Write a protein that binds this ligand. Structure first.
Ligand SMILES: O=C(O)C1=C(C(=O)Nc2sc3c(c2-c2nc(C4CC4)no2)CCCC3)CCOC1
Length: 134
């Protein structure tokens, strides 16, 4: 009955490219990058009314955000940055912008064939992470 229906469900990580470089660009330190790079998270996406919830579950750490499209919220990220986030839908793509200390990074999620493709961009550096249904 809505746009976001194509995203809903439980997803598992199947491939990752350039994720160590993207994390260096964001400022993540060595030990966190090593543990993050080894993670094989599940991503669980659900909708209730106007509220969308995205859960990332892994061996080390579970994180979860709930939000309304276009309404800014405060978020603590898995590497413990405190950021201001806004998530919108742009032409069928979920676009998550995070701002902290004069910096910005964007995470886009798109459905492509049977995959949910996550593209993370900071300055010049892009990491692509591909998920399939669990
Ligand atoms: O869900 C995804 O595929 C995305 C990300 C992701 O899985 N990150 C994980 S899983 C995870 C950890 C981290 C982590 N990210 C960071 C910085 C880069 C943001 N520091 O630690 C650390 C603890 C163990 C499990 C991040 C980028 O956006 C999409």
């Amino acid at each position: 009955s809505h746009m976001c229906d194509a995203f809903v469900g439980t997803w598992k990580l199947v491939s990752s490219e350039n994720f160590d470089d993207y994390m260096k660009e964001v400022g993540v330190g060595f030990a966190t990058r090593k543990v993050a790079g080894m993670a094989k998270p599940n991503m669980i996406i659900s909708v209730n009314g106007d509220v969308i919830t995205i859960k990332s579950e892994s061996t080390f750490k579970n994180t979860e955000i709930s939000f309304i499209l276009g309404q800014e919220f405060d978020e603590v990220t898995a590497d413990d940055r405190k950021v201001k986030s806004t998530i919108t839908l742009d032409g069928g793509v979920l676009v998550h912008v995070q701002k902290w200390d004069g910096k910005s990074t964007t995470i886009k999620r798109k459905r492509e064939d049977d995959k949910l493709v996550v593209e993370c961009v900071m300055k010049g550096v892009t990491s692509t992470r591909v998920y399939e249904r669990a």
